[PDB]
Paper text:
We purified the full-length yeast [name] containing an [name] mutation, which allows ATP binding but blocks ATP hydrolysis, and assembled Vps4E233Q oligomer in the presence of 1 mM ATP in vitro. We used single-particle cryo-EM method to obtain the three-dimensional (3D) reconstruction of the 300 kDa oligomer without imposing any symmetry at a resolution of 3.9 Å. The structure appeared as a hexameric ring, consistent with the MALS result. Although we used the full-length Vps4E233Q for the oligomer assembly and the Vps4E233Q protein in the hexamer was intact as evidenced by the SDS–polyacrylamide gel electrophoresis (SDS–PAGE) gel showing a molecular weight of ∼50 kD, the six MIT domains exhibit no EM density, likely reflecting their dynamic locations due to the long linker of ∼40 residues between the MIT domain and the followed ATPase cassette (upper). The subunit A shifts slightly away from the ring centre, and the interaction interfaces between it and its two adjacent subunits are only about half of those between the other subunits. Moreover, the ring is not planner, in which subunits arrange in an upward spiral from subunit A to subunit F as manifested by the relative positions of the α3-helix and C-terminal helix in each subunit, resembling a split right-handed spiral ring. Agreeing with this, densities for nucleotides are clearly visible in the nucleotide-binding pockets of subunit B through F, whereas there is no clear density in the nucleotide-binding pocket of subunit A, suggesting that subunit A is likely free of the nucleotide. The inter-subunit interactions occur both between the large ATPase domains and between the large ATPase and the small ATPase domains including the β-domain.
Author numbering:
A (entry chain B), B (entry chain C), C (entry chain D), D (entry chain E), E (entry chain F), F (entry chain A): 119 to 437
């Protein structure tokens, strides 16, 4: 009957969300400011009902949705455009009706439709057959809630905003463009995870490597991080001949990963090695070089020409 | 069985609608006049059954309909593309038979069908099984009732008209085009959307606005209005200083933003001091100027070509 | 089982309807004639079953079916895909069976199926789930009435002829093409639809209007009539001053709309005038001229392009 | 539980059924021969298990089944696929098992399933799942096998052998393609339906009728004949003058319409002229000419594509 | 509580079943050879839980099963494919328990299931009622036969293999492919179906039968045989002329159809020939010239390709 | 999921895996090591989520997956991709997610997806909707959660590790090649195949057989063993006379196959052979030469080489 999707409590703060200040401003203004001071928004003015995030994949749109949901002080409705039901003799609209309707009585609430471009058909697709009932139903019901309930937030996280129909995006309110990460943002994104190996060289090297690794997405950064995690393990693959860097005064000889060519190295059962005698090497520049060697820029120039054209004619902020 | 949807009275005035006088009087002739003056309705005179609205979306079709909700002085039921269940396979038609049944036995009532383009068929293949019979039902319910005796009114509000079926088109009586509001109309939209704010110190400002802003609907204009309301709040959010120029007749001193180069002013922030002792400045021009610069027009010119093509097919007045 | 249709009685005469007396002759010959002269239909000469009406929308094929229904003297029942439909995801063949049988009980019977394309396809991919079963039943029932001897007359009215199936087409009688109204017919339809209103009766005016009104169905002409009827009401809503045109034979001084600077110009509003003294203005010539200035032509060619391909080498029968 | 379906049979000969002689001959082989000479089918040989007819619509395959039923001198069962169908939902195929049980319990019976395409064919749907069990039970009951078993001739008709299931085609025994008739067969078709009226009794006329036009089934020819018969009657409808062509030997003047320039011409209402005194006009070539000019030949080449793809490469007797 | 399924004893044996040497093999060691093993049944040899027969239609799976049932001398009850279903929508698996339990109670047992794909998929709909627990019940009963001594054997037979459910197959062992008979096998089948037919005993002519024919099964070959047998019937029916060939050694005057150009040929009709005096002529190559041209195969290559991907994918280990 | 998925606590051990050095390297660092020492990883290093097992068919990838699942005593859930593509028209996302939920509820489980390749296919048509969304869904679920709860392990299996996730193309994670067994391994598998039963020839003969087979699989060997079990069978069938074994040891006469004339060849026929007197002899070279004869080459040729090409290219880590 209901089939309601649960909303967990993820821990992503504003300090974790690196870069893009204007979006943060828009979101605080959108949700946090009316929660902080409600009597200001009265009479004529009403809060932003339909905020649109857009950009290429892996850039932290879902991550920002989760971030807002962390510091919401409110309910949430996580849902994908495709993943609930899709074409079974029609009827994928009742789900929407129960979604919005059950968001009405529970005031201050945040809806999130992941990838709205999947609903609309660019050539024909389901939009010719039965998905017109979806596109219509969303189009009508999104405005009917803000007419009745007054200020129920719907957050757009589309990848393809220009194939998307013009009728949806004019009913949907202000836009938020997501460009590629900049100096400070990429920099801080390196020092979030791990932190057991006590840093690397000074922050100038994070900027040098940063400018070398500029143009990467958030997922690309995550993959770099994962690579760096796996680096000492692939250094363990090459070893099987363990040297002790420290002295013999400790409880056990600290086994470092290294080749047999280096002196003072001996072999043993690598499977049955305890954690205390293990020791990771320092994270070298070759981590970033292996990252580079994975064929990086998914964000190519010719594809995002359209992104930046559909950007500039509306711009920062928007509808 | 019954499936009641609307039983409310949202307050909308006569003067809220701006563009086209003849478009309003078309409805007024068609809706209120026969109920008000039934003695005139005798013999050869027949009621204007069916009032379709069309045009580029955002301009004010749904808004017009929901104005009519206040202006009707009678019970009515809206409906989207939400004919319920085909899991049973049979009840989809019977719901329409109930819908048309619940309209006619109750004396003068209305039915609002949002987005008639969804309920459309012509190519067939996939339509034949499920929705072809729905379209046929739609056709057959407004076939015999159209002439002689009729206590029902049909309404329509589509995004794009030309994809609709020919049979529904020609058989439906009164279609109306809703263009982009002119300088006087949009000015009137500005004037009404001022509301409870303490005035604006100019009359030519509206002219400046509506002349500069070209190719805007009611929606995005109201969005701009919302923005320009939330501008001085942002000014307050950035600004710290306050020179005491508050009246003694009020309950207490009220915080308003002032310039840094101005002596005798406390610099305690909006966050520290209470919100009940806060004040917003009067609306300027520059807030609207920058609001225009942020919010560029949503309605593209390429979409209007086929709109006007449909107009020169059928036009402002129905048929 | 007992859920039957109600037989209403709209007084539609033969001489009132215009457009093709050959069709009328086919109808009378099929329906009324054998009731009239039953001895003339005894032997090889027989009344064939299944006269198909079709054409563009709003041309009056449904209305012509009602014209048969009026003067047939027939205990008839008509139904589209409303009552006769599957309910339990299965059986709607019995409904056809007892439908035909309950028509076979009283044998001055006509069965009118409005929009036969609803209960028809061609292959349908997964048509065996439902529609093939009912369609097949329909096919198998009227085999015995198509030729040989049975006293039932089937009728049909559809806008899309090519989507109708071959095997149904060869089960059916003569398919009478109903085109758009022509000069003389159209000319007739003006004064008949207007009724007994004072409409300055001269045939030259009808000649002129009929000349000017090119490319119009029958329904749109009734809409035009309706517009012309609504016109003097509109003048009543734009009537500032009134004057007594008629003499003092009636009980009160009868007031009718006039020019502002006229003799005896009473200033009270149109709503304040009582029904006994409220007299509508007489119908002019230019009211129609302006009506057709507002009322643009109805007939789009795109639908008729296939009918141009049809009517030449198809038209009468399949072919 | 028991519900038998048996009906009376009027006169239908072998001679009047025009078409392929081998098809009729094959039916003689399958029907009359085993009853006449049963000792021939005792040992190696067995009677024909089943013959499925197929072709374009209105070709007389149902009429052929009728003819066989007349000339069988046996218990002729005839029932469609969707007639015997589950009302209860639980029980379903037991109706079929009782039916073929009835076929077994009576000595050599003949079964007829009109439109076999209703069931049989499916593309992984299973006709709403539940009715796949009928599809399945039809095979396991041992009807279509070409080995051993009781002599029970199952018959059928279909317009779509490509939609028909391959496994059943392979299972069920013999096919007969029913083609469209040629000069000779068509000529016969003309010369049968005559009756009391002696039109123009020569072979030149019928061979002109057959030679001029082309592309006919059997039902359309019948329709044409009917039209031709009705021609003089509709000419009696438009009868101004009257003439006594009949001799004085009769009881009263058997009147008929005539040309204006005639000796002893009289004018009155044609309705008052009774059956005994109404001499009908004799039929002519021009009557058939006008018949043709109204009633077109009814064959379409789009149906012949998928038919001939099933036939032309193979020839006769099936796929 | 009547559970008396039709026990029968056909006259088919291993000698008159041509082709499928591997299948004949695999059934010999699955049943009859295990009947001769009441000592080395379990231990070395793993007994078969179930045998799946699959392939194109008309290959002879049912025929094979029946032959087996004749041969083995076992308590056999071939299941009704569809009828194991809830009549009252309550009891259902009681019938399964009646089947399997009584099949266990006499342990020279065989259970044959023609069309195991009757339990077709799921798709929701009406499968969730008693059919779900039928599906489960099959699985519990085949877990029942898995335990204890394997007297019962699940002989799976189906036309469409891929539509059968996964979970049945995953708990199922033996899968014997049944292809179309090759040249030798087809020749031997012809030889079998000849039997007691006059003459035609030359191996070059049986080559000739085998050579021209391509891609056939047992059903269509039987049909061909039947046709061949019916040729001399037609040659009797056509030939009016006759002559006595038999001498005084034969007692009865054996009448037989002579050549047309024959001196002193009596011309009494074929219908006047009595049973005692009849003599039908011997078969020739002329019969097979007409048979091969007339009769033709059904199933396409693509079905066999589906069987080849089923062959390559499924069959091995536990698929 | 309604018995489509297998579940058990398997007890499959390292000792039964003959020489799979690759598994023994990769799994022991990826899975076993984290099980042993969870705290052994510095920073945010967390266990592998997905492992692809890839190689030719019949290497017991299932056996290996079960052995992996044996180590934590983890529940082994497993499902076939092929099986849920065509039957349902797989929109199984909701059920996959529920599956994951239920498996997550049970503390560490392992998910096994067999033939992951069957999901891929950039073909087009209606297959797109039943493939593309599954592929998208697969690529989301492979990193559906950010470590934390996907310590629960996904094992993919493929025989054709080209085309999409297994291939050069994109994504996955750590992959392992599962090679065919070498001579020694195959010999050990022969040693482990079934439970012998009375006496065979030498382990070196089996090495000879294993030497004779290059590129043949564990499954091919299992086919040879299934053929081995039929050696006594085919002895029973093919010999006409047998020879006595019972000297002074056995109580009753017991036979082995020989030629008709031999020293101690009993003379009654194979058909006569009673239960007790039947005795399978030892399996000799001649029985295995006959096994060599009756096992044709199994294996596809070009895939081996392509997978060697991918092995040379990739294998280490994700792509
Ligand atoms: N501004 C940011 N600050 C820190 N981390 C980020 C930022 N943007 C992206 N990331 C990282 O990228 C990872 C994945 O990004 P995410 O999947 O949210 O992108 P997405 O565009 O929403 O993808 P999809 O549209 O497919 O859901 C996150 O785990 C997060 O750590
Ligand atoms: N030939 C005519 N004579 C008189 N009135 C007509 C004629 N044609 C149309 N009308 C008027 O216009 C209306 C036509 O409506 P109607 O529903 O019959 O059109 P239709 O084409 O049959 O509809 P559909 O396409 O649904 O079958 C009628 O109410 C009738 O009064
Ligand atoms: N060869 C023929 N001889 C005599 N009458 C014929 C012949 N062919 C057609 N007819 C006449 O025309 C009609 C044909 O209708 P019938 O249903 O028998 O054809 P059909 O091919 O079975 O149609 P369908 O395939 O649509 O069921 C019959 O009523 C019959 O009187
Ligand atoms: N090897 C054979 N020898 C003799 N006759 C055969 C052979 N194979 C098939 N036939 C004949 O063809 C017919 C095949 O019918 P059968 O029902 O056994 O095929 P099937 O594939 O099981 O069909 P279904 O699956 O629809 O039951 C049998 O009646 C039999 O006479």
């Amino acid at each position: 009957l209901s089939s309601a999707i649960l909303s967990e409590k993820p821990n992503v703060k504003w300090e974790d969300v690196a870069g893009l200040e204007g979006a943060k401003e828009a979101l605080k203004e959108a949700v946090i400011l009316p929660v902080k001071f409600p009597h200001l928004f009265k009479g004529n003015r009403k809060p932003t009902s339909g905020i649109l995030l857009y950009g290429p994949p892996g850039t932290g749109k879902s991550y920002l949705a989760k971030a807002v949901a962390t510091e919401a002080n409110s309910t949430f409705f996580s849902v994908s455009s495709s993943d609930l039901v899709s074409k079974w003799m029609g009827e994928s609209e009742k789900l929407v009706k129960q979604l919005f309707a059950m968001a009405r009585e529970n005031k201050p609430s945040i809806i999130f439709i992941d990838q709205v471009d999947a609903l609309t058909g660019t050539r024909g697709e389901g939009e010719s057959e039965a998905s017109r009932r979806i596109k219509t139903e969303l189009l009508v019901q999104m405005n009917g809630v803000g007419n009745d309930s007054q200020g129920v937030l719907v957050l757009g996280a589309t990848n393809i905003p220009w194939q998307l129909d013009s009728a949806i995006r004019r009913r949907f309110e202000r836009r938020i463009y997501i460009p590629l990460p900049d100096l400070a943002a990429r920099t801080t994104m390196f020092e979030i995870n791990v932190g057991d190996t006590p840093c690397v060289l000074t922050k100038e090297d994070y900027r040098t490597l940063g400018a070398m690794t500029e143009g990467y997405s958030g997922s690309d950064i995550a993959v770099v991080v994962k690579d760096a995690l796996m680096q000492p393990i692939r250094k363990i693959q090459s070893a099987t001949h363990f040297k002790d860097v420290s002295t013999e005064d400790d409880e056990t000889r600290k086994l470092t990963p290294c080749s047999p060519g280096d002196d003072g190295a001996i072999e043993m059962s690598w499977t049955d090695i305890e954690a205390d005698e293990l020791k990771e090497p320092d994270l070298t520049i070759k981590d970033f070089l292996k990252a580079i060697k994975s064929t990086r820029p998914t964000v190519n120039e010719d594809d995002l020409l359209k992104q930046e054209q559909f950007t500039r004619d509306f711009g920062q902020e928007g509808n």
